Amino acid sequence: QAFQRQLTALIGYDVTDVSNVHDDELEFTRRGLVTPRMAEVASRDPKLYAMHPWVTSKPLPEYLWKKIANNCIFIVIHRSTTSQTIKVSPDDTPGAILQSFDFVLRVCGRDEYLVGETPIKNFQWVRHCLKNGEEIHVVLDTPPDPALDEVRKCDRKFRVKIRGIDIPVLPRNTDLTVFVEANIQHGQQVLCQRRTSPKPFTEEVLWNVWLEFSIKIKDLPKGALLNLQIYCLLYYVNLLLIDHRFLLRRGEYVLHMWQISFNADKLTSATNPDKENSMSISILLDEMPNQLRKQLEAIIATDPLNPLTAEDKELLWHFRYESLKHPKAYPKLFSSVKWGQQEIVAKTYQLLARREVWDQSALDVGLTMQLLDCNFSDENVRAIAVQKLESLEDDDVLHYLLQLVQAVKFEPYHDSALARFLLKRGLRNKRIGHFLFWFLRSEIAQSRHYQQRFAVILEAYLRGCGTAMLHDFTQQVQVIEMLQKVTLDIKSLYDVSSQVISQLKQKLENLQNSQLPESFRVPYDPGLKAGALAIEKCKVMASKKKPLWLEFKCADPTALSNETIGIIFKHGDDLRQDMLILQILRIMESIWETESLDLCLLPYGCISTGDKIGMIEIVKDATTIAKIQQSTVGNTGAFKDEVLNHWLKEKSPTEEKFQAAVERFVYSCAGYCVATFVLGIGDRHNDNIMITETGNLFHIDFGHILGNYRVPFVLTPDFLFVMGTSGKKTSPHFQKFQDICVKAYLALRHHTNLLIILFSMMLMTGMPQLTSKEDIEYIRDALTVGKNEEDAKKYFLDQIEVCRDKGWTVQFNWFLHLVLGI
Numbered sequence: 001q002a003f004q005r006q007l008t009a010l011i012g013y014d015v016t017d018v019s020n021v022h023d024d025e026l027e028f029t030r031r032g033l034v035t036p037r038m039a040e041v042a043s044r045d046p047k048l049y050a051m052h053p054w055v056t057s058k059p060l061p062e063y064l065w066k067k068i069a070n071n072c073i074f075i076v077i078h079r080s081t082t083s084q085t086i087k088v089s090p091d092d093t094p095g096a097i098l099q100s101f102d103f104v105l106r107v108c109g110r111d112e113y114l115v116g117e118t119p120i121k122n123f124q125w126v127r128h129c130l131k132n133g134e135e136i137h138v139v140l141d142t143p144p145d146p147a148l149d150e151v152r153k154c155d156r157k158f159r160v161k162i163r164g165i166d167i168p169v170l171p172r173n174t175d176l177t178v179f180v181e182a183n184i185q186h187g188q189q190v191l192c193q194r195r196t197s198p199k200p201f202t203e204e205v206l207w208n209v210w211l212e213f214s215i216k217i218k219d220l221p222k223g224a225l226l227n228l229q230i231y232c233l234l235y236y237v238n239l240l241l242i243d244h245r246f247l248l249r250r251g252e253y254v255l256h257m258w259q260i261s262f263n264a265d266k267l268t269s270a271t272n273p274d275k276e277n278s279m280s281i282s283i284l285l286d287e288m289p290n291q292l293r294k295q296l297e298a299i300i301a302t303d304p305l306n307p308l309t310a311e312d313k314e315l316l317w318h319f320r321y322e323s324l325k326h327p328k329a330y331p332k333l334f335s336s337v338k339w340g341q342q343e344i345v346a347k348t349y350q351l352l353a354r355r356e357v358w359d360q361s362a363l364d365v366g367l368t369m370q371l372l373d374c375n376f377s378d379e380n381v382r383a384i385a386v387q388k389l390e391s392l393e394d395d396d397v398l399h400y401l402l403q404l405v406q407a408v409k410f411e412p413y414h415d416s417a418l419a420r421f422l423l424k425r426g427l428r429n430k431r432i433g434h435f436l437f438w439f440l441r442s443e444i445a446q447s448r449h450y451q452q453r454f455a456v457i458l459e460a461y462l463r464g465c466g467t468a469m470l471h472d473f474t475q476q477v478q479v480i481e482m483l484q485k486v487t488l489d490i491k492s493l494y495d496v497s498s499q500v501i502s503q504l505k506q507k508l509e510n511l512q513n514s515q516l517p518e519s520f521r522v523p524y525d526p527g528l529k530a531g532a533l534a535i536e537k538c539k540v541m542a543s544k545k546k547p548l549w550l551e552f553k554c555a556d557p558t559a560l561s562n563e564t565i566g567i568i569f570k571h572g573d574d575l576r577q578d579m580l581i582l583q584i585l586r587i588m589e590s591i592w593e594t595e596s597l598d599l600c601l602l603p604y605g606c607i608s609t610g611d612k613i614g615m616i617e618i619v620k621d622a623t624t625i626a627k628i629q630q631s632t633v634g635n636t637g638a639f640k641d642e643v644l645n646h647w648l649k650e651k652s653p654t655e656e657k658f659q660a661a662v663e664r665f666v667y668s669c670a671g672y673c674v675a676t677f678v679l680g681i682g683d684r685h686n687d688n689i690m691i692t693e694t695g696n697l698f699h700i701d702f703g704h705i706l707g708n709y710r711v712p713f714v715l716t717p718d719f720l721f722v723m724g725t726s727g728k729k730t731s732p733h734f735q736k737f738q739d740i741c742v743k744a745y746l747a748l749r750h751h752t753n754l755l756i757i758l759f760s761m762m763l764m765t766g767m768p769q770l771t772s773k774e775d776i777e778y779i780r781d782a783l784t785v786g787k788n789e790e791d792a793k794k795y796f797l798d799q800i801e802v803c804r805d806k807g808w809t810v811q812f813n814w815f816l817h818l819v820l821g822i
C-alpha cells in the first residue's frame with residue numbers, strides 16, 4: 001500500500017482515484033498495460049539494462065574523422081592511484097581494449113559505461129569527446145549489480161438528446177444567448193453537425209431536444225468523437241461515441257466542460273475536474289492514363305500542409321491501389337477516406353492488409369509522425385506508423401521522444417499502440433525511461449486535459465523500471481520540490497538586495513543541513529550525479545522572474561574536473577515551450593549530421609518540472625551579448641560594433657584560440673540564424689543571446705518569445721565585425737558564413753516534411769496561443785516549399801542582407817521596449 005502511495009508522490013497524481021470518470025477506460029488501461037510491462041521486463045538483459053550503454057549505429061561524421069590521427073584513439077584508464085593511457089583502434093570493442101589492457105570501463109565522474117559488442121567509435125560519449133576535442137578518461141571498476149534493478153513482484157440515424165447546461169455562476173456579461181453545437185468528429189474532420197435553438201443565457205438552460213444526425217449508427221467509426229460546444233465559443237467537452245470495448249456509448253451523462261483552433265487540448269476525452277466552477281452539460285444516448293498519373297504524383301509530392309481538394313481526394317481514393325505503392329502518399333490517401341461510411345472504412349482495411357510496400361519501405365520518421373497527428377483517429381492507420389517506429393534504435397528514440405510523448409495527446413483512447421510503444425522502449429532502456437518519466441511528469445503537473453492518461457502511462461513505467469530507478473526519481477523529485485519552494489518564496493521578496501541574497505543563502509543553508517538528499521541525478525543529464533550545493537556561488541539573478549542561480553558539487557569522487565554543476569531554477573514561464581524548441585534544435589543537428597555538416601549549436605538541458613517552473617543547465621563560461629555591451633556602454637543602448645571582437649581576444653589567452661573562437665562563432669552564428677529563421681523565432685533582443693568564452697553563440701529563454709509572440713533574425717554589426725566586415729564590405733569569414741548558411745539551410749530543406757510535421761505538432765501541443773492555420777503555415781514559406789535550390793539559396797541570402805540593411809535598428813528598438821519601457 002505504501003507502494004501505491006510512493007507511486008502517487010512520484011507521479012504527482014492519484015491514478016486509482018475515480019472521482020473524475022464516467023467510465024472505466026482509465027482503469028481498463030492500467031490492467032491492459034500490465035502485459036506489455038511484464039513482457040518487456042521479463043526479456044531485458046539485466047547486465048545491459050543496469051549499464052545502459054549509450055551507443056549508435058550511424059556512421060562517424062566526416063568532421064569527427066578528421067579529428068583522428070591514424071586508426072588511433074587514446075583512452076586514459078584509471079584504477080585507485082595508478083593511471084595509464086592506451087592506443088586504440090576506432091573499430092575495436094570495449095572487451096578488446098580490456099584484454100589489450102570481471103571489470104568494466106566507466107567514464108570518470110559519470111554514471112556512464114563503455115560496454116557491449118559495439119565499436120569504440122559507436123559510443124556517444126566517445127563522439128562527444130572527439131567533437132569537443134576532449135580526452136576520454138575511464139575508471140576501471142566492477143559492473144553494477146543487476147539485482148539492484150529488481151522489480152516488486154443499427155440502421156438508425158444517430159441521435160443525442162441535449163437536456164441542458166448548468167453553471168453555478170456565469171460571467172458578468174449581461175445579457176447574451178447560448179446554443180449547443182454537437183459535432184461528430186474523426187481526425188479533426190467533422191462528419192455531421194447539429195445545433196440547438198438559441199436560448200437566454202442563464203445559469204441553467206434546458207432544451208430537452210433530440211438532435212438527429214444524418215449518419216447511421218453502423219456508419220460510426222471507432223474513435224469518433226461527440227464534440228459538444230457552447231456558443232454565445234465558451235466551452236467544449238468530448239465523449240467517445242464508441243468506448244474501449246467496441247460498445248456504443250449509452251445512457252445518461254453529466255459532463256463538466258473546459259472553458260476557452262488547432263489546440264490539442266480541444267481533443268481530450270477528459271472532463272473538467274473542477275466540478276464546482278465548471279460549466280456542465282447533460283445529454284442522453286440511447287493502367288492509369290498518363291495525365292492522371294502525373295496529376296496523382298504531383299499530389300503525392302506536395303507538402304504535408306498542402307490542402308487536398310475534393311477532386312484530389314476522389315483521385316487518391318479511386319486509384320488507392322496505385323497510391324498504395326507510394327509510402328509518401330499514405331497520409332494523403334488516408335485523408336481521402338470517408339470514415340463516415342462503414343463500407344469505405346471496410347475497404348480501407350482491406351487495403352491496409354496489402355502492406356507489402358509499406359512494411360518493406362525504409363523508415364521515414366517525418367512520414368511516420370504525420371500518421372500520428374490530429375488528422376488520424378483510426379487505430380489501424382496509426383498502428384502502421386507505430387509499426388515503423390519499432391525499428392528505431394534507442395539512439396533515435398531519444399531524438400524524437402518528447403514529441404512522441406506529445407503525440408499521445410492525439411490518441412483517441414488511453415490504451416494505444418503508441419503508448420505501449422513508449423512504455424516498452426522506456427523499460428528497455430534506462431536513459432529513455434528517465435526522460436520518459438520527466439516528459440510525462442511535466443505534462444501531468446500542468447495539464448488537466450491529459451494528466452489522467454499520462455499518469456496511467458507513467459505508473460505503468462514506474463512499476464517496471466526497477467527498485468534502483470524508483471529511488472533516484474524519489475531523490476530527484478524531493479530535491480526539485482524543495483528548490484521550487486525556495487524559488488517561489490524568494491520571488492515574493494530590481495536590484496538583488498543583501499536582505500535577499502542573505503535570505504537565499506540562508507534558506508539553502510537550512511535545506512542542505514539535514515533535509516536535502518546527499519546526492520541526486522541531474523534531471524537534464526542522467527549521467528551526472530549532483531552532491532552538495534556551493535552556497536557561496538548561489539545567487540538570485542538580475543531577471544524579472546528572479547530565477548535561482550544554483551551550483552552543486554559532483555557527488556562522484558572519480559570525477560576529474562572540480563567544476564561545479566550549475567543549474568538555473570526559474571518560475572514564471574512555461575518551460576515546455578523551451579523544451580520543444582531545444583529538442584527541435586537537436587533534431588536539426590542530427591539532420592545536419594547526416595549531411596556531415598556541423599553547426600555548433602548549444603541545446604542546453606531544460607526540464608519542465610511543474611507549473612510555469614523548471615530547471616535549466618548552466619552553460620559554463622558564457623555571458624549575454626547585451627552584457628558584453630553594457631560593459632562598454634550601460635544605461636544607453638549605444639551599441640558599438642567592435643566590442644564583441646574585443647571581448648573574445650580578451651578571453652582567449654593564445655591568439656590562436658582566438659581565431660578558433662571567431663570560427664566557432666561563425667559556425668554557431670550561422671546555425672542559429674538558419675535554425676531560428678525556420679522556426680520563426682529569430683527576432684530576439686540580444687539579451688536573449690549568449691556566447692561562450694570559446695566563441696560559441698547560442699540563443700536562450702525561448703519561452704519568452706513564445707509567450708508574447710522586424711528582422712528575419714539576429715546578424716547584428718557586432719557579429720559582422722567579428723567576421724571582419726562593416727557596411728558595404730565583405731570578407732574571407734563573411735563569405736564563409738554566407739557559405740555555411742546556404743549549406744545549413746539547403747540541408748534542412750532536404751527534410752522539409754519532417755520539420756513541417758514537427759513544427760506543426762509543436763504548435764498544437766506546446767504553443768496553445770500559436771495554434772492558427774496561419775501560424776502553422778509559416779514554416780512552409782520559411783522553407784520556401786516547391787522552389788529551386790538556386791531560388792531558395794537566394795531567398796536566404798536576401799534575409800541576410802536585410803539584417804545588414806537594418807544594423808542596430810531593431811536592437812535599439814528592443815532596448816526601448818524591454819530595457820526601459822517604450
Ligand SMILES: Cn1ncc2c(NCCCS(C)(=O)=O)nc(-c3cccc4n[nH]cc34)nc21
Pocket residue numbers: 543547568604616617618619620622623624627700701702
Ligand atoms: C543556458 N544558460 N547558460 C547560462 C545561462 C544564463 N546565464 C545567466 C548570466 C547572464 S549574464 C550575468 O552574463 O548577463 N542564463 C540563462 C537564462 C536566464 C534566464 C532565462 C533563461 N531561459 N533560458 C535560459 C535562461 N541561461 C543560461
